[PDB]
Amino acid sequence: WTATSGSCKGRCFELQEVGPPDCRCDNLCKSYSSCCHDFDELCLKTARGWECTKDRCGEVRNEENACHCSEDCLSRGDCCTNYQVVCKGESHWVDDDCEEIKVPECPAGFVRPPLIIFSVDGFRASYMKKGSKVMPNIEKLRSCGTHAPYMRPVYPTKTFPNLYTLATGLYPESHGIVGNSMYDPVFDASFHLRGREKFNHRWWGGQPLWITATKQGVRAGTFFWSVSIPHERRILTILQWLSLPDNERPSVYAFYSEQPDFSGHKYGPFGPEMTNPLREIDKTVGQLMDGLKQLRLHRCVNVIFVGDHGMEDVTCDRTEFLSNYLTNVDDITLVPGTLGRIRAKSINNSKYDPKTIIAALTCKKPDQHFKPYMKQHLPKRLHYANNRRIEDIHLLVDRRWHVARKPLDVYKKCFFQGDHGFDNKVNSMQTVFVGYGPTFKYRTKVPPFENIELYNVMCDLLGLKPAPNNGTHGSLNHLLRTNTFRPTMPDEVSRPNYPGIMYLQSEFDLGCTCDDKVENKLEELNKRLHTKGSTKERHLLYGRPAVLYRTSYDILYHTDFESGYSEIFLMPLWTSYTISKQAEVSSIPEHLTNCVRPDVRVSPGFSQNCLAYKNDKQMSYGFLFPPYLSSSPEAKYDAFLVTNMVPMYPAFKRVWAYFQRVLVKKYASERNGVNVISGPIFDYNYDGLRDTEDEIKQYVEGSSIPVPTHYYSIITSCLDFTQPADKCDGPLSVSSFILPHRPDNDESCNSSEDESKWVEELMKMHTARVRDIEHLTGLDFYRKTSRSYSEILTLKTYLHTYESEI
Numbered sequence: 001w002t003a004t005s006g007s008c009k010g011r012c013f014e015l016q017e018v019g020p021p022d023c024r025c026d027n028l029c030k031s032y033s034s035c036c037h038d039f040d041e042l043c044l045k046t047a048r049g050w051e052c053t054k055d056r057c058g059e060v061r062n063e064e065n066a067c068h069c070s071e072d073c074l075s076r077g078d079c080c081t082n083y084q085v086v087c088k089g090e091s092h093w094v095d096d097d098c099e100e101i102k103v104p105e106c107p108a109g110f111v112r113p114p115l116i117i118f119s120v121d122g123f124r125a126s127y128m129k130k131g132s133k134v135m136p137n138i139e140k141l142r143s144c145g146t147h148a149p150y151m152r153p154v155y156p157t158k159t160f161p162n163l164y165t166l167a168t169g170l171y172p173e174s175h176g177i178v179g180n181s182m183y184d185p186v187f188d189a190s191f192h193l194r195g196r197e198k199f200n201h202r203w204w205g206g207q208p209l210w211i212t213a214t215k216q217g218v219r220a221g222t223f224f225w226s227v228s229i230p231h232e233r234r235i236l237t238i239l240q241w242l243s244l245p246d247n248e249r250p251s252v253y254a255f256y257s258e259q260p261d262f263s264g265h266k267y268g269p270f271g272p273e274m275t276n277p278l279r280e281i282d283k284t285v286g287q288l289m290d291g292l293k294q295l296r297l298h299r300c301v302n303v304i305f306v307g308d309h310g311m312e313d314v315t316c317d318r319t320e321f322l323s324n325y326l327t328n329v330d331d332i333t334l335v336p337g338t339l340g341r342i343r344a345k346s347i348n349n350s351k352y353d354p355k356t357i358i359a360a361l362t363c364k365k366p367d368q369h370f371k372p373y374m375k376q377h378l379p380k381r382l383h384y385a386n387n388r389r390i391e392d393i394h395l396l397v398d399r400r401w402h403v404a405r406k407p408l409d410v411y412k413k414c415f416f417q418g419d420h421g422f423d424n425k426v427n428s429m430q431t432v433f434v435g436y437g438p439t440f441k442y443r444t445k446v447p448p449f450e451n452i453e454l455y456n457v458m459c460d461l462l463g464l465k466p467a468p469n470n471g472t473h474g475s476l477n478h479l480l481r482t483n484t485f486r487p488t489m490p491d492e493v494s495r496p497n498y499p500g501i502m503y504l505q506s507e508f509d510l511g512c513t514c515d516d517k518v519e520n521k522l523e524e525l526n527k528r529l530h531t532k533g534s535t536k537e538r539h540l541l542y543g544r545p546a547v548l549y550r551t552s553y554d555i556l557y558h559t560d561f562e563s564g565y566s567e568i569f570l571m572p573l574w575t576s577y578t579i580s581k582q583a584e585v586s587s588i589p590e591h592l593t594n595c596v597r598p599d600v601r602v603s604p605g606f607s608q609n610c611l612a613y614k615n616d617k618q619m620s621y622g623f624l625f626p627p628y629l630s631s632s633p634e635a636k637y638d639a640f641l642v643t644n645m646v647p648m649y650p651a652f653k654r655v656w657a658y659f660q661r662v663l664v665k666k667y668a669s670e671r672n673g674v675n676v677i678s679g680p681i682f683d684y685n686y687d688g689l690r691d692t693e694d695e696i697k698q699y700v701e702g703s704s705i706p707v708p709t710h711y712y713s714i715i716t717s718c719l720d721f722t723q724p725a726d727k728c729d730g731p732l733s734v735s736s737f738i739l740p741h742r743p744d745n746d747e748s749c750n751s752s753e754d755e756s757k758w759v760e761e762l763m764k765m766h767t768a769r770v771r772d773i774e775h776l777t778g779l780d781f782y783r784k785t786s787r788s789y790s791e792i793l794t795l796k797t798y799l800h801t802y803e804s805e806i
C-alpha cells in the first residue's frame with residue numbers, strides 16, 4: 001500500500017528513498033506504483049520542450065516550463081542545456097577545439113572530480129567507426145579522451161548481467177544475475193525482465209558502485225531510471241543535482257539509454273532505421289556536455305561512455321527446435337533464445353536423465369547451430385558455472401541463431417531482426433568504452449579490455465577502496481593520467497626444494513621399464529650442469545612461477561625444460577620450456593615408445609607408477625615436456641622421466657599430441673620462438689579456483705594419482721617478432737588455453753577426421769587469460785621480467801580471441 005496523499009512539492013528527484021506507505025518522489029517511484037499524486041505535474045514538466053529559442057531569452061520565469069531561459073536560471077541550476085548558446089553567444093561543446101585537461105578545473109567546493117557514467121544499451125563496437133558521421137559529440141569524446149577499439153562484455157551478453165557486472169566488477173556467476181530470466185531452486189523463485197520479483201534484493205549479490213561509494217562517504221545519484229522519464233529530463237535532473245550545495249551533491253551519477261538496443265532488435269544492427277537512434281543518442285551527449293559547460297564543469301567531470309553488449313542479425317527463420325531432437329520434449333523446461341538452459345519440468349519425475357538429453361542433442365545434424373554442454377565443461381573463459389541459478393545443461397548457440405523448445409513458441413508467444421546474448425568473444429557482441437576528463441589520458445588509444453575491469457577504475461576515479469571483485473586491479477592503469485593503483489606482487493607462500501640425486505634405481509618398484517641401459521668426462525660433466533640448472537635461463541624466461549599456497553614441491557632442472565614438481569599431487573604444477581624458430585621436431589624412437597624412467601631426485605613414495613596406468617583401463621598418460629622437441633637423442637631420455645608424466649585419457653591424448661608435435665613448432669616458426677609453460681588444473685567444483693587435495697573426485701585407479709579436469713599452456717614470445725623469444729628487449733605477447741581433460745571428443749563433431757581438421761578449432765574455443773590459469777592453479781607467473789608490473793597485469797588479462805578484425 002502507498003498513501004499517495006503526500007506531495008512532491010520541492011522534492012522532485014529526491015536522493016533518499018522514503019519508506020512506504022509514504023509516497024515517493026524519487027526517480028524509481030514510477031516503477032513501484034508509488035509516486036505522489038502530483039509527481040507528473042511537478043516533476044515531469046514538458047511545457048515548451050527542451051531548448052531555448054531567441055524569443056525565450058530573458059523571459060520572466062514561468063515555473064511550468066520544462067526548462068528555463070530566464071536570467072536567474074544558471075543560479076537556479078535549471079536552464080535548458082542550450083541556454084548560453086542561444087541567449088549568451090556561447091558555442092556548443094562539440095564546436096570547441098579539443099584541449100588537454102591536465103588538471104581538474106572545478107568550481108570551489110568540489111572535493112573531487114564528479115564521475116558520470118553514460119551507458120547505452122546495445123551499442124556495438126563497430127558503431128564508433130560506422131556511425132561516426134552522425135555522432136559528432138561521441139566522436140569528440142572518443143578522439144579527445146581515452147578509448148579502446150572495443151570492450152568485451154560478460155557472458156551471457158544480455159543487459160542485466162552486463163550492467164550489474166559493470167557495477168560490481170564480478171562475473172555473473174558471482175553477482176547472481178546469470179540471465180535475463182532465472183529460477184533459483186533454494187528460494188523457489190523466478191526472476192523475469194518484466195515484473196516485480198526482480199526488485200527483491202536477494203537476486204543482487206556483490207557490492208555495486210553506489211553502495212561502495214555510500215559506505216565510504218561518497219554520495220551517489222540514483223542509477224536506475226524509470227522507462228517513462230524521457231532522456232532530456234534525465235540529463236536535466238543530473239545537471240540539477242550537480243548544482244546542489246557541497247554537502248548534498250553526489251560525486252557519482254549514471255545515465256542510461258535503452259537505445260540503440262531497442263531499434264536494433266526491430267531492424268538489425270545495421271538497418272537503415274538505425275541512423276536515427278544513433279543521431280538521437282549523440283544529441284543527448286551534446287546536451288550533457290553543453291549543460292556541463294554552462295555549469296563550468298566540462299573540464300572537471302570524468303565522463304565514461306560505455307555499452308553493455310552489441311547486437312547481431314538474428315531472424316525467426318534461424319531457430320533450432322529441441323522438438324526436432326528430443327522425443328521427451330514436454331518433460332523439460334528450456335530458457336530459450338541466444339543461449340539455452342535446460343532443467344527437468346518436474347523434480348518429481350525420476351525418469352528424467354541429463355545424460356540422454358545431452359546425447360540426443362550432440363552432433364545430430366550436419367550444420368547443427370547449437371552445441372550442448374554440461375556447465376562444468378563450458379570454456380573456462382566464460383566463468384559460467386558456479387551458481388545454483390545456472391542449469392546443469394547449457395546450449396551454446398551459434399551467432400545469428402536462436403534455440404527454442406517447439407515451433408509454437410516462435411509464432412505464438414517475423415518480428416525481430418536483431419538480438420544478442422551469444423558467447424562474449426563474438427565480434428558482433430563487443431561494445432564500447434570511452435573515458436574523458438581530467439583523470440583520463442589525452443588522445444590515447446588503449447587495447448581492448450573486459451568490462452569486469454571497470455569497477456576498480458571507477459573506484460580509483462572516486463578515491464574508493466573497491467570491494468573484492470574479479471578485475472585485476474592495476475591492469476587498467478594505462479587508461480589514467482593520475483589516481484593509478486600501484487599493487488605489489490603477491491608474496492610467495494611455499495619455497496621449493498632443490499633435490500639432488502638421492503635414490504638408487506633399484507629402490508623403485510613402479511612397474512615401469514625403459515630401454516635405456518646403453519652407455520667420458522665430456523658429456524658427464526655436461527649432464528651434471530644441466531641437472532643443476534645451467535640452461536635454466538633459456539627455458540625459464542620470466543622467472544619461476546610463485547606458489548601462492550602452502551604445499552610441498554621440488555624444482556627439477558633438465559637440458560630442455562624445468563619443472564616445479566608437486567610431491568602432493570605427484571606431478572608438476574608447471575613445466576617450462578623454450579622452442580626456438582630453429583628447433584627441430586623428432587619422433588619417439590621405436591625402442592622408447594613405452595619407456596618411463598624413475599627420477600633419482602624424487603622418492604618412490606612421491607612418484608607415480610606405471611602399474612596404476614596398466615590396471616586403469618580408461619586412463620593412459622602423456623608428458624608435459626614433449627619427447628618430440630628434445631634437443632638431442634641424449635636429452636630425450638629426460639622427457640620420459642616419471643616426474644614429467646601426467647594422466648591422460650586416450651581421447652585427450654589425440655588433442656595433446658597434435659598440440660605438442662605440430663602446433664608448438666608452428667607457433668615457434670610464426671612467432672620467432674616461443675616459451676611454453678604447461679601443467680594440470682584441478683577444478684572439480686567448477687568455481688574457477690584451484691582445488692585442494694580433498695576436493696579431487698577422480699584418481700588413476702588403485703592409486704593416489706589425481707586426475708586433472710583440465711590442461712593449460714601459456715605461450716609467450718616477443719611482441720616485436722623480429723626479436724627471438726629468448727632475447728626479447730621489450731613488451732611480450734601471449735596466448736593461453738585451458739583444455740578440458742575429457743574421455744571422449746564429443747565436443748568436436750569432426751573428431752573422426754585427422755587432428756588437422758578439428759584440434760586447433762577446439763583449442764581456440766578454449767582460449768584463456770593467464771589470469772584464469774592463475775586462479776585455477778594458485779600460481780603467479782611473469783615474476784621476473786624487465787617490464788613494469790602494471791604492464792604485466794595487462795598482459796595477464798589479455799585474451800587471444802581468434803575473431804577477425806572489428
Ligand SMILES: *[C@@H]1O[C@H](CO)[C@@H](O[C@@H]2O[C@H](CO)[C@@H](O[C@@H]3O[C@H](CO[C@H]4O[C@H](CO)[C@@H](O)[C@H](O[C@H]5O[C@H](CO)[C@@H](O)[C@H](O)[C@@H]5O[C@H]5O[C@H](CO)[C@@H](O)[C@H](O)[C@@H]5O)[C@@H]4O)[C@@H](O)[C@H](O[C@H]4O[C@H](CO)[C@@H](O)[C@H](O)[C@@H]4O[C@H]4O[C@H](CO)[C@@H](O)[C@H](O)[C@@H]4O)[C@@H]3O)[C@H](O)[C@H]2NC(C)=O)[C@H](O)[C@H]1NC(C)=O
Nearest residue numbers: 173174175176204205206386387388468469470687688775
Ligand atoms: C570473483 O570474485 C569474487 C569476489 O571476491 C570471488 O568470490 C568470493 O569467493 C570466496 C571464496 O569462495 C567466497 O568466500 C566465502 O564466503 C562465505 C561467506 O559468504 C557470504 O558473505 C560474502 C561477503 O559479504 C558475500 O559476498 C557472499 O555472497 C554470495 O552468496 C550470496 C547468497 O548465496 C549471493 O547473494 C552472492 O551472489 C554470492 O554468491 C556467490 O558466491 C557463493 C559462495 O560464497 C556461491 O555459493 C554462489 O554460487 C555465488 O557464486 C555470502 O553472502 C564463507 O562462508 C566461506 O567460508 C567457507 O569456506 C572456507 C574455506 O576457506 C572455510 O574457512 C569456512 O569454514 C567456510 O566453510 C564452511 O562452509 C562450507 C560451505 O557451506 C562447508 O563445506 C564447510 O564445512 C564449512 O561449514 C568463504 O570464505 C566469497 O563469498 C565470494 N564472494 C562473492 C561475492 O561471490 C570469486 O572467487 C572470484 N572468481 C574467480 C574465478 O576468481
Ligand SMILES: NS(=O)(=O)C1CCN(C(=O)N2C[C@H]3CN(C(=O)OCc4ccc(OC(F)(F)F)cc4)C[C@@H]3C2)CC1
Nearest residue numbers: 117119159163166167193194209223224225227254256
Ligand atoms: N519494465 S519493462 O519496461 O517491462 C522492462 C524493465 C527492465 N528493462 C531493462 O532492460 N532495464 C531497465 C533499465 C533502467 N536502468 C538504468 O537506468 O541503468 C542505469 C545504469 C545501470 C548500471 C550502471 O552501472 C555502472 F555502475 F555504471 F557501471 C550504470 C547505470 C538499466 C535497466 C535495464 C527492460 C524493460
Ligand SMILES: [Ca+2]
Nearest residue numbers: 121122159308
Ligand atoms: Ca542491453
Ligand SMILES: [Ca+2]
Nearest residue numbers: 683689690691
Ligand atoms: Ca575449484
Ligand SMILES: [Cl-]
Nearest residue numbers: 158179180181
Ligand atoms: Cl537469459
Ligand code: NA
Nearest residue numbers: 613616617619
Ligand atoms: Na590404462
Ligand code: NA
Nearest residue numbers: 745746748751
Ligand atoms: Na566427436
Ligand SMILES: [Zn+2]
Nearest residue numbers: 122261265420
Ligand atoms: Zn536487447
